[PDB]
Design a protein around this ligand. Structure first.
Ligand SMILES: Nc1ncnc2c1ncn2[C@@H]1O[C@H](C[C@@H](N)CC[C@H](N)C(=O)O)[C@@H](O)[C@H]1O
Length: 271
């Protein structure tokens, strides 16, 4: 229900809407988003001509980067029409002899063999009842030496937080309720075991876990700063209610990454 024109006011030109990676401290938002995509794609050991699946591809930035820098064939899946349309157009506009396609299709319906899989903050949009099924499907469509890079948010429970010196406040519970009752992610995040245990049961080895908690804090701060700087135009595209809701989500989430209440990581998964 939120127009691309609203998101365009605060995202960088890649349209990437997930945790960036400030590999160098002076990177711009765009450089840090490309660095996050490259950080993940480098872990897949892509050779030109391989086929990469991006599960939950958003507006196509990682797919475009994969084609341009890694010279791979690409398939992107999304359930959002707006994500599909922009991904479709952007991929068609790349000059490449490779196959590059976006699809309005869920991973549940995708059964084609691919060489490698990437996914950036789609897994939290899956129902917990599909966590194992997702890893089983991913394992099935990969070759014997296949690799998956799962970039996913995840949460911590009260006990673990407490052991780390962190408490959930009444305000945090209200913020979680706000997330669930909104168009924003973070309401029903998986735990780390939800990711690791189900991946391992499907047959994957967790070769590496790279946490990006403080990179997300910085990313969210940048989105919030951009949106506030374009407040009038954002209100015109949507409304003051929506603008304030987004600022609440962006700054509230940034605060909570800094505090350590949740995390985001890249899981390198091998067969
Ligand atoms: N079962 C599903 N299968 C495929 N895509 C899904 C599924 N559920 C949600 N999605 C898509 O996952 C994406 C979630 C986004 N947060 C991912 C953003 C994108 N990967 C980025 O880095 O900017 C959206 O494009 C959803 O439409």
């Amino acid at each position: 229900d939120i127009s691309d024109d609203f998101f365009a006011l605060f995202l960088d030109p890649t349209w990437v809407y997930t945790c960036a990676y400030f590999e160098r401290d002076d990177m711009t938002l765009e450089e840090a988003q490309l660095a996050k995509v490259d950080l993940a794609l480098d872990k897949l050991n892509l050779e030109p001509g391989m086929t990469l699946l991006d599960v939950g591809c958003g507006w196509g930035g990682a797919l475009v980067r994969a084609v341009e820098k890694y010279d791979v064939n690409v398939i992107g899946l999304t359930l959002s029409r707006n994500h599909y349309e922009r991904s479709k157009d952007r991929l068609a506009a790349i000059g490449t002899q490779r196959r590059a396609e976006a699809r309005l299709q869920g991973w549940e319906e995708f059964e084609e063999n691919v060489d490698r899989i990437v996914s950036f903050e789609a897994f939290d949009a899956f129902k917990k009842e599909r966590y194992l099924t997702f890893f089983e499907r991913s394992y099935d469509i990969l070759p014997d030496d296949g690799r998956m890079l799962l970039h996913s948010l995840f949460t911590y429970d009260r006990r673990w937080l407490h052991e780390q010196g962190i408490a959930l406040t009444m305000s945090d519970l209200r913020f979680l309720k706000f997330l669930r009752e909104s168009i924003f992610p973070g309401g029903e995040l998986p735990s780390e075991p939800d990711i690791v245990d189900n991946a391992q049961a499907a047959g994957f080895t967790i070769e590496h876990v790279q946490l990006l908690q403080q990179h997300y804090a910085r990313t969210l701060d940048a989105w919030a700063a951009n949106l506030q700087a374009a407040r009038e135009r954002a209100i015109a595209v949507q409304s003051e209610e929506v603008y304030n809701n987004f600022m609440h989500y962006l700054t509230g989430c940034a605060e909570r990454f800094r505090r350590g209440l949740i995390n985001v990581a890249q899981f390198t998964m091998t067969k």
